[PDB]
Structures are given as C-alpha cells and as structure tokens.
Design a protein around this ligand. Structure first.
Ligand SMILES: C/C=C(\CCOP(=O)(O)OP(=O)(O)O)C[C@@]12Nc3cc(C)c(C)cc3N(C[C@H](O)[C@H](O)[C@H](O)COP(=O)(O)O)C1=NC(=O)NC2=O
Ligand SMILES: C/C=C(\CCOP(=O)(O)OP(=O)(O)O)C[C@@]12Nc3cc(C)c(C)cc3N(C[C@H](O)[C@H](O)[C@H](O)COP(=O)(O)O)C1=NC(=O)NC2=O
Ligand SMILES: C/C=C(\CCOP(=O)(O)OP(=O)(O)O)C[C@@]12Nc3cc(C)c(C)cc3N(C[C@H](O)[C@H](O)[C@H](O)COP(=O)(O)O)C1=NC(=O)NC2=O
Ligand SMILES: C/C=C(\CCOP(=O)(O)OP(=O)(O)O)C[C@@]12Nc3cc(C)c(C)cc3N(C[C@H](O)[C@H](O)[C@H](O)COP(=O)(O)O)C1=NC(=O)NC2=O
Ligand SMILES: [Mg+2]
Ligand SMILES: [Mg+2]
Ligand SMILES: [Mg+2]
Lengths: 364, 364, 363, 364
C-alpha cells in the first residue's frame, strides 16, 4: 500500500495523465466581458467562508498524499505555502496511517506547519464497508486537528486498479450518516476524477450530506493512472481501462448537476482546474470554491518558491476574471453573466436542467 | 458460391472494412457515472433470458460462416467457447448447405460441441422469393437443432456484389408470415451492416415479426467488402460502392428506431459492438442483448485461447459499466441514466423521436 | 469567343469544383430500408420533362458552344444524351446571335439528338441590353429547342474582368412579355451561386414556374473568374478570393425553392457528382437532378468515357431507389430523409417549418 | 512612455496578433445570395450619414496612434487617403499630447491634410477617474477640430499591461455624463478588442451614451500585444495573458448585443473587419458603419499607394456584397436577408436574444 502511494505520485507527476482523452467541458463556459467593470482592481475582495473559518481566496488544495516520509515532505511544502496564502488544504487518504503508525507523521506535519488554515482529513468510502467507523474517523480528524473530513468516491479507480475490489453497498451510507451525528466537524463527499451526478448527489443528500466536491473528468485521469499501473505489470485490464478513459461526468456538468439537484449544497468545483480563469468559471457556474490537486503536486515537487509562484499566478488570473466581469467580490462572481454552449448545453438539456431555473439557482 | 464464403471471411478478417467511412453514433451516447454505485462488483448479475433459455451474459455471437471444412473449424472454435461462456451463437447463411450436402457438417459441428446454449439458424430473405419455404427453414433449423432462425436483410450487399440480384418483393413477407405459423422456433429478422429503420421495423411487425437484430452501420461494412471483391475483379461497380460506404442507419439510431416504433420487441443491438462498454451502451439505449460478429471471427482465427480472452475482456468491460452506473443486473442497466448528444440527437429529432416518450419506452 | 474556350479549359483542368464551397448534401441522409419491398429489376426511372418523357430524372445543364472545337464537345454530349434518353441544355447562345459562324456549334446538338428535350440558353443581362422576342425565338429555332433557360450570373459578372452586372427589374417585365409569345416554356437557372426564396418568389410573381437551383458546392464560377483575373494580373482576384464561399448551397436552394414555390418544376443542380447526390436532390424536393462539369470532363475524354459516366450515375441512382424502397421517381420524392447540421440550422433561421416542408416535398 | 506608443505600433504591425486564438464569429453570419438583384452595379449608392456630415462609404478608420513625429507621419498618410475617399478617421489616444506639448503636431497634421471628413478625437476612460475633465476633452477636440470624441474602454489591456492599473469606478460615468452636456460634439464609447456586452451598453446608455463602437474580439488582440510586451521584459504576467487570449465578446455577438439592447444606438461594428464582405456582414447584422484599424496601419506603413489600393479593394468588396444581395444602398443592406448559424446562434439564444424581435430591430 505504501509503494502504491509513491507510484501514484510518480505516475501523476511524471506520466501523461492530465486530461488524457477526457474533458472538463469548461471550454463550453464563457464569462461575459464587461468593458466598463465599475470597479478598480485594487478593491477586488477574494475572501470567503470555509465552514467556520475565513479564507483568503475561494480555492482549495484537495487531498493527494501522505504515508511515507518523502510524501510527508511534499505535504509539508504544500501546507506551508497554503498557510502563507490563507488557502485550505486536504490531505490524501489516511487509511495507511490508521494501519501503520509510522505513517502518521507524514500527515501530522501539515498541521504543525499550517496552524490556522482549514485542514481537511481524508478516508475512502470503501473503508466504511470494510469496518471503519466513528473511531477511525475521529482518529483521522484528530491526527491533523482537521476542520472537516472528506470521504472519497473512487469506484472507477478501484475497478481498474490491479489490487482489488469495488465495494459500495448502501450500508456504507447508513454508517456515514450515523458517524456524522457523533463527529464534531463536517463531512465532505468528493469524487476522484469521474464526477458527481444528480442521482449520486441526491442519494448522498438523502443521507444528510450537504458538502460536495465534484472532482469531475477532464483533470487527473485516475482510470489512466491505473491503466499505467496495469501496463507496467502486464495486467490485461490495461486494454479495458483504455476503453474507459473518457468515462465520467465532466467537471463543468458535475457543477451544474450538483448545484441544480441540491441548491443549498456547499460545493467545491474541481477536476482539471488549471488556471484562475478555470477557477472563476467553476465559481460562476455554481461552485462555492474551486479545488486543485495535480498542478499543486507538480509545483510542490519543483519546490517551495515554485509553488508560491503558482498560487500568485492562480490568484492574479482569478482577480483578472473578476475585474473583467465587474465582480467586486466572490458573491458577485457567483452571479456574473455567462454563456453556455456546445456539448455542455446539450448535456444540460438532455438531463432536464432547465436553464431558466438554473440561472436563478446558481445566483440566489 | 462456396469460395465466396471463403473470400468473405478473408476480406472481413484481413482487409480494412471495420467501420470504414461509417459510424455507429455510439460516441453520441454517454452512460451517466454514479460515484456511489450502491452495489459491489461481485454481486453484479449478468444473466438474462433468450427465448426459453437462460444465458450468462446479455451478448450473442451473430451469424457469419459455414459451408466448407475450414469454415466449419472456425464455427467449432466459436461454438465451444460460446458454450463455455453461456453465450448464444448464430451460424452463417445455410443456403450453401440446403444445396450442397457436403456443406452440412460445417454447421452441424456447432451443436455437437455446444449442446446447451441457444443456437440460431440463418437463411436470407431473397431465398424466400426464390422458392425456399417451410421445408428449407425446418431443414436449416433441424441441421443444428436451432432454438430460433434468423432471416437476414442484405439488399445493400446484394446491390454492390458482383454476382447478382437484389429481390425483396412483399410476397417474401407473406411467405415468412405463413412459415412462422408452422415453425416450432421463433424468427429473428436481422440486417447485415446497414441497420433497421422504423419503416422497416413496422412493416416486419405488421407481418408478425417481433424479434429484431439491428446490425447498423459503423461495424463490418458489407458495402466495403463487396467493393473490395469488385476492385479485385476489375468490376466497375467498385467506384459506385465507394459512394455508398456511409449508407445505412447507424447502430445507435437503429436501436432507438426499433425500440421506439416497436416498444415490445425483443431486440439485439449490433453492428460495430467492439467492447463491453459498447455492449452496455446498446442495452441502456434500448436493446435486450448486444450482438457481435467480426471481432469474434478475428479472435477465433487466432485460436481458442485468444477467443476466451476476448470474451473475458468483453464481460469485464460490461460489468465495469454496470458497476459504474449502479446497475446490479441487466434490467437495471436497461433503465440507467444516459445522455444523448450530437448527430444522434439531431437524427432522433428529425425522425420525430420524442425523447420524453423515448426515455419511457427504453426504461421498460 | 475566346472567353468561351478559356471557360471550358479552366473548368476542365483547373481546381474549381467545390473550391472553398459546399452543397450541404452531406447534411442530407436517405433512410435505409432493409426490406425494400421491391426488386432491382422493377425500378422505373422514367419521368416527364414538359411534353416529353425521359428515361432518367437527370439532365445535362447548359455549358458551351461558339467555336468548332466547342461544337465537337456539344456533339459528343448530345449523342450520348440521345442514347440514354436524357435532356440536354446548351451553353449561352449570345455568341451565335451575333457571329453567324458560331451557329453550327449549337445546331449540331439537334442533328445528332433528334428526340430528347433540348434546352436553349440566353443570359438575363441580355434582356436589359436589347434582346427580346426575336432573339429568344432565334435561340430556340436554332436547335429546335423544347424550352429555353435564362441564366442568372451576377456573381460571375461582378468578378469577371470584362464588364458589367446589370439586373434592373425591366428585364423581368420583358421576360414576362416574351413568355406570352413563345411556344416553349422558360426555365430560370443560376450558375453556381443558388436561388433563394426571395429570388424564386420574385421570378414567380412575373410568371416563372420552372427553376434550376445551380447552387454553390459544384462548379465555382467566382473561382473561374478569379483564375482569369490572376492570369491577367487583375486586382479583382484577391477580392474574388473573399467571395469563394458566396451563395446558397444546392441542398438549401432546393429546400428554398420547393418551399417558397410548392408547385414549381424544379431542377436540383450545382455539385451533383453521383447518382446518390442526384437521389438526394430529388428526395429533397427537386423533380430532376442536373449536372454540367463532370459531363464536360468525361466528354473531353471521349464518347465511351461519357457513356460509362452515365451508366455509373444511373446505377447509383437506382441503388439509392432500391435501398430506400422507391419503385419509381415519385416514390423517391416522398422517401424518408434525415436533415442535420448546417442545413438544418439554415432552414430554421430561414423560417422553413420542417413539418410543412415534409408535406410540400411529398405532395 | 511615448515609446510604449511606438512599441504598440511595432508589435501590431509586425508580430502575430491579428485574430490570435480569438474569433469574430463572422463566419457564423451568411448574407443570402440573390440571383436576381433587381439593380445594376453602377447604381449602387454607398453614401451614409456620420453625425452632421455625409460620408462616401459606410466605413471608418478607428483610432490608433499619435505621440511622436514618426507616428504623426503614419497619421498623415491615413488622413490624406481617408480625405480622398470620403472616409471618417479616428486618431489614437491623445493623453500623450495633453501632457507633452511636442506631441500635439503628430495629431494636428490629421486635420491639416483632411479638412472635410469627420475626424474623431480619442481619450481613455481611465483618464476620467484620474482627473481629466471638460477642459482636457475640449483640448483633445480643438487640437484636430474634431467632429466627435471617442472614449475608449480597455480594462483587459490594462490588466495585462506591465505598467499599471485598471480603474473603472462609476464616478467616471457621472463625469462623462456631465462633460457631454458642455461639449459641442458627440461622444462615442468604443472598446479595444474585447467587445461591448448588453450590460455594458445599457449602463452607458443610462448615463446618456447613444454612440457605440463594438471593437469585439477576433481582430487585433490587445491581450496578445501586452502578452508580447510581458514576454519581452520577462514579466510573469505573460503566462497569465496567454490564458485570456480568447477573452471577450466576439464582434458579431457584440453587434447583436448592442443593437438589441439599445435599438436606437448609432453603432460602429469593428474588431477584425478585414474585407468589404466583413464590413457588409457587420452592417447587415445591425451596425450603421464598419470600423477598421490594423489593416489600415499595415498598408499605411507600406505607403500612400498601398493604402489607396486597400480602400479601393474594401469598397469594391462592399459593393459586390450589396450587388449580390440586391442592396441598392446602405439602408437596403441593413435590412437584407441573412442566416445566423453555429456558435453565434447559441450565443444569442443563451443571452435571450429573441431572433424574431432581433430581425425587427436590425431592420427598423
Ligand atoms: C481516487 C484518488 C485517490 C484515492 C486513493 O486510492 P487508493 O490507493 O485506493 O486509496 P487507499 O486505498 O485509501 O489508500 C487518491 C487521492 N490522492 C490523489 C493522489 C494524487 C497524486 C492526485 C493527483 C490526486 C489524488 N486525489 C484526487 C484529487 O483530490 C482530485 O479530486 C483529482 O485529482 C481531480 O483534481 P485535479 O488533480 O486538480 O484534476 C485523491 N483524492 C482523495 O480523495 N484521496 C486521495 O488520497
Ligand atoms: C450480409 C452478410 C452476410 C449474408 C451472406 O451473404 P450472401 O453470400 O448473399 O449469403 P447467401 O446468398 O445466403 O449464400 C454474411 C453473414 N455472414 C457474415 C460473415 C462475416 C465474416 C461477418 C463479419 C459478417 C457476417 N454477417 C453479418 C453479421 O452477422 C453482423 O450482422 C455484422 O457483421 C455486424 O456486426 P459486426 O460484425 O460486429 O460489426 C452475416 N449475417 C448473416 O445474417 N448471414 C451471414 O451469413
Ligand atoms: C454562369 C455560367 C455561364 C454563363 C456564361 O457566362 P458569359 O460568358 O457571361 O455568357 P454570355 O455573356 O451570355 O456569352 C456559363 C454556362 N456555361 C458554363 C460553362 C461550363 C464550362 C460549365 C462547367 C458551367 C457552365 N454553366 C453553368 C452550369 O450549367 C451549371 O449551372 C453549373 O456549372 C453548376 O453545375 P455543376 O457544373 O454540375 O456543378 C453555364 N450556365 C448557363 O446557363 N450558361 C452557360 O453558358
Ligand atoms: C485599447 C487600444 C488602445 C489604448 C492605448 O493604450 P495605452 O498606452 O493604455 O493608452 P494611453 O495610456 O491613453 O496613452 C490603442 C488605440 N490605438 C491602437 C493602436 C494600434 C496600433 C491598433 C492596431 C489599434 C489600437 N486601438 C484599437 C483599435 O482602434 C480597434 O478598436 C481595434 O484594434 C480592433 O479593430 P481592428 O484593428 O480592425 O481589429 C486603439 N483604440 C483606441 O481607442 N485608442 C488607441 O489609442
Ligand atoms: Mg481505496
Ligand atoms: Mg445472398
Ligand atoms: Mg452572360
């Protein structure tokens, strides 16, 4: 399992798996340019709420890694930069540290170095059907003094991953619902590159889930990562993974689906957010914050100052989109004028997303 | 006419005629990803009914060959693997064996080696206007102890094939309707690479036909095969065949057309089914089972263990698609959520396929 | 005289067929019928062309004439058309109204094709330049024509180095008067840029009932004149280039004319290159399919080349009828189609109600 | 400073910034061909009104340059040819000449050499928030005896330009409105490559602005120009500019939006007008006149006779479109039949541009 954590980072960082045969549908979203913005750049306010805390920018780093010391040093760099910028940070799956106690430090370092920002713990849905419960959740949370815990959905990844098994019985949701009653922090349910649909969002909501992270297709392709792991071990599933490279809900469509089917959700729009303009689009479309993982990893590996430059660039690009839409603050961005075209439009139409009611929901 | 059988197999197996200038429209069908499936992979049930028998997977091998001993050995390999996997198998046109009695064994071997699975006999619609009747149908059936007989439509192929004629007078259907009253097994009407429209489906239904096999364009291109036979004999029809390479109803559209216009039909979706994902899409769209021919031929030529690996891959991919849509069984897959986009959408719209009533009919 | 030779040479040997243009015929699909309900041998391709019967619903539209080498091309086309029972238009006869030595290069057509419909040809601009009844009667008598086509070519005239585009309404007043005295009917045809519903309705309001779409996507006359311009260092060349995709695509023109004048007799032409294109043109609303350029190219190759060409067109037409369950031309006109993509958006923007369209193209 | 002025001309003239990663959407507009025009070429009348003057062609040169003598000599060439053709001419931003008095001659030369055509002064909207007022406007106007003054919107350019700031407080519009009461000539508000939306047009109209110049995306890409200036000085904003290369309202969409949202506006359609056919399309879509800048610059640099040939070509192409549309004059062109397809069609639909009421407004 420890080797898999390193192999994941190495394939994501150095192989060709970002947007491989997949699409966010964000090219189908246009933010309407305002030649008279009505504001000045210096007055743009990017602050927003993240549960009980305030954050500096409506962007987060979503969970990636942890489990060995070299992974901990990646976590350390991301956490210290995130703290500097006032940006929330999720950690990778903490399964490895619930088991092997030597793996705990590679997660705990995050809170040592980032005492103020929201920190989000991480466990997988399949562990709920395998005997994780309240205590494991509390241990994941306490380990980093987390402000929330993300529970990940990754059935696509599990199906193609060489080492077993995709298990998603409804009992897991009953358990999740029970756990949420005893926990002192909120639960976020996030996908892992394949996106959340309205049926999935409504099912989760019916069990008390109110916080969602789209992780749609078009960014890091987890089916591709497992495909590569399969190719590497001469596992025949590789050719089957290849047929599923474009499987999933595109990020842009997932954001629309979650916002429309659960209008009061707190929503992270993620999966292929690569610029402050993507982030601006995600928010205008209906997300409360934009999430990123892969490009943060790649910069962090390059080093601290590379990662600081990366965030400087994201933030500037976000502010430029706010400036050029006349959005003085995040709230104004959420209601700014957009155009939806092409395949995203056809997707919304077939799925019964009445654009008229969509407009009202995304902006009230 | 025996060596036409050989030439067909050789061109299909070794020339470039799969999907040549043609399209299934299956790229316009998306199965909606469910990040919380509600099931586990191991509980997925792929069993379904095929007339009076149960089959293990909702997939069949459609009719191809027979007529000489080398063709019989291909039939033998396919039949033994299909028996092993619990998959129905059609044989190729049995005309050759109604005439030449030496050709009978190359069909009969199928039932010797596959005693339990449904086996489907095969005769051509033109033979009905050329003097075939009850006795020839009963002989075709008895020869392999068939559980059904497929009657093929191939006017496109006949038009471009160097040797003779396209004959499809309505008298053939009168005869077919009479024969169906005396036969102890059901009749399936199948196309052969060019697809079944609603006009054709309704006409066949008005003569008592209830079982259809779409064989749409986008897979094996029979116009291309005959084009190649023409090029080879310096026949001028070759250039004309080239103008018709994209002629026919795409598989996806044919499935919609048959299901919509004959809502209670038993429906095989075929013509360019190349993965278990294609098979999942065909079923979700409205078929009861997915049919395949060419890729089974190519693998069978490679050998028994190649064909076994092929089916293992198809079945895995089908189950992956079911897993990732939350479909515990074939019935759930038939009603799972989809998106229809692009040209298939415009096709449906022009043809008056009301998507609202469409969604209703396919989900039953 | 020399323009006439240059036109044939550029059309035949330069790259001007469908150059930056489109028929929109790729947006039309004929619905395949796996049970046709007919046999190939019973397919009947006969149809009416005014007072005559023709063997196939296809015509050769007007191209050339004016010198003896052009007459020998006309002769080859006419003799093959006669053999196949196919109507033939000749090129503009202006040259032969003027120069009397040019008459034989047109007259040869009737000598060699005594039974098929033969269609005379004069340009609409000539009506504002003094041509009238007598010139029309001369063009007709010269080949014992069964009809006369009057061509519209303002686009060609705008970019052609030598002079002017003149289309005052007076021309139509004159045309209407002429039609009262003439013993054969008038067809109005374009020349590569298509007939719109505004143009069709205007012509209909002056008594014109016979149209030939000659839409964009086939022979590109703006391109031909662009080439003549490039050759003489004329600056208009670069401007012609900007207009290479100007005009109504053939498929859209057929829809527009059939829709806006439901009882018209309609030739669908401009980029018809196969019997499948011909089948589509007819299913879409034309009564017959016209061709020019590919007949020219084959004729230049020779008699037997042109015979093989027609054999191919006819087989391809019959294949589409077979595969559509169309026993005759009338059944083809009502066969099931799908319209997609840009043609669909064109019709929508133009207010072509598809529901009423279907009714009109069928009845 | 003043060499930013020369650097702009140099990059625009000699680098690849025309339509870079951007689009006018003019390919989605088709003028319907009329095979019987009902006119002759020689009777086509291209005259139209430009405020209190008559002009020979419905085309103008929009503002570009001025500030140094070499820039003045470009202005001189453009002005003398515009005078010869009866075409209105805008000058570039006159800020430089309000400040440095040595820069005045490079603007004044325009009126010396073009005594009769409309000449349009130019000042930036940002200068209104930076203390420019009535006197600066009157000085800009008097310096060239202007018949109007254009106030330019360029927040996109300012955001990416290395030297300083985007400031667009509503106070500027209050000031602009006050200034317009004291001015003896009308105000045009123009963009600068990124286009005017309906929200921006309605806001300006609410402050008394009735004259608009779209300057949509698809022509000169000002974000690209500044990107290049950034690349040249190793400024990190370069990579961010690259993410915004396709930002803005396309010219064709901007024409539709301004005509639709302010039906009585006097409207210049500009941003990527490169031929008389583009000019014809812009007018048929709803503009009163077509504007051009970059191609006029490029020809002017080549010299007087190159620029004369350029206009000869534009005018011929415009008349060809009028001829082939049966438009005897500019008024008939404004109501000629068109087709709108593709992305422009989807843009208008999403933005609630009812095509039925649209046709009425552009024709009346
Ligand atoms: C499915 C992924 C997993 C589950 C672990 O599998 P198992 O080994 O079965 O876990 P175990 O059995 O419990 O040990 C790993 C994950 N770590 C992970 C590694 C790296 C390197 C990349 C790039 C991304 C993620 N993300 C997805 C990101 O958070 C984003 O949502 C996504 O990448 C889209 O954003 P984009 O990258 O900006 O386009 C993860 N998400 C998680 O929820 N948990 C994690 O641990
Ligand atoms: C028209 C085709 C014929 C009729 C025989 O012609 P005639 O010689 O006139 O018969 P006669 O006069 O009676 O002697 C041959 C056929 N054999 C045949 C051979 C090979 C090698 C392949 C690949 C395809 C088929 N299929 C089509 C397949 O079953 C599928 O429908 C199709 O391939 C789409 O699925 P994909 O392959 O997955 O894309 C046949 N269909 C049949 O109904 N009968 C047959 O005998
Ligand atoms: C505008 C064209 C003219 C007018 C002559 O110009 P002027 O010199 O002004 O004549 P004058 O001043 O009066 O002496 C020439 C034309 N001859 C002609 C030459 C060649 C070689 C080809 C290929 C095409 C045509 N066609 C168009 C064809 O009939 C078809 O409509 C068209 O080609 C689309 O079908 P596709 O080729 O199958 O794609 C003609 N159309 C005519 O009506 N008259 C003719 O004389
Ligand atoms: C925003 C533009 C500016 C601001 C100056 O920057 P600052 O230094 O901030 O100004 P300061 O601080 O006040 O000194 C420069 C501009 N000059 C200018 C230079 C050249 C060389 C080109 C090609 C074009 C423009 N245009 C836009 C053109 O008129 C067209 O609208 C546009 O090009 C689309 O039409 P297409 O070229 O046909 O595609 C100008 N527009 C203006 O309103 N003012 C000008 O000074
Ligand atoms: Mg896991
Ligand atoms: Mg046969
Ligand atoms: Mg002429």
């Amino acid at each position: 399992i420890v080797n898999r954590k390193v192999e994941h980072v190495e394939i994501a960082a150095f192989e060709n798996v970002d947007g491989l045969s997949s699409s966010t549908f964000l090219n189908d979203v246009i933010l309407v340019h305002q030649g008279f913005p009505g504001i000045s750049f210096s007055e743009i306010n990017t602050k927003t709420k993240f549960f009980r805390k305030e954050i500096s920018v409506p962007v987060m780093v979503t969970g990636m890694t942890g489990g060995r010391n070299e992974l901990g040093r990646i976590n350390k760099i991301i956490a210290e930069v995130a703290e500097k910028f006032g940006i929330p940070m999720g950690v990778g799956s903490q399964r490895v540290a619930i088991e092997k106690a030597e793996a705990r430090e590679s997660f705990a370092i995050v809170r040592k170095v980032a005492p103020t920002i929201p920190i989000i713990a991480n466990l997988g849905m399949p562990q709920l059907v395998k005997g994780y419960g309240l205590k494991e959740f509390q241990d994941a949370i306490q380990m980093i003094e987390a402000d929330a815990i993300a529970v990940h959905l990754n059935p696509a990844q599990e199906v193609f991953q060489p080492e077993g098994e995709p298990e998603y019985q409804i009992y897991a949701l009953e358990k999740l619902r029970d756990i949420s009653k005893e926990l002192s922090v909120p639960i976020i349910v996030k996908e892992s590159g394949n996106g959340i649909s309205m049926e999935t969002a409504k099912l989760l909501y019916s069990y008390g889930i109110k916080n969602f992270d789209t992780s749609g297709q078009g960014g890091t392709n987890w089916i591709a990562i497992e495909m590569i792991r399969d190719i590497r071990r001469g596992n025949w599933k590789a050719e089957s993974a290849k047929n599923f490279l474009d499987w999933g809900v595109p990020t842009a469509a997932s954001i629309m689906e979650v916002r429309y089917s659960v209008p009061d959700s707190f929503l992270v729009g993620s999966g292929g957010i690569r610029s402050g303009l993507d982030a601006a689009k995600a928010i205008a479309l209906g997300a409360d914050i934009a999430g990123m993982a892969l490009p943060v990893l790649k910069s962090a590996i390059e080093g601290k100052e590379s990662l600081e430059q990366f965030f400087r660039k994201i933030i500037f690009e976000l502010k430029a989109a706010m400036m050029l839409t006349g959005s003085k603050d995040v709230d104004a961005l959420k209601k700014t004028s957009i155009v939806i075209l092409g395949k995203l439009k056809e997707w919304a139409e077939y799925r019964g997303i009445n654009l008229s009611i969509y407009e009202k929901v995304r902006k009230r």
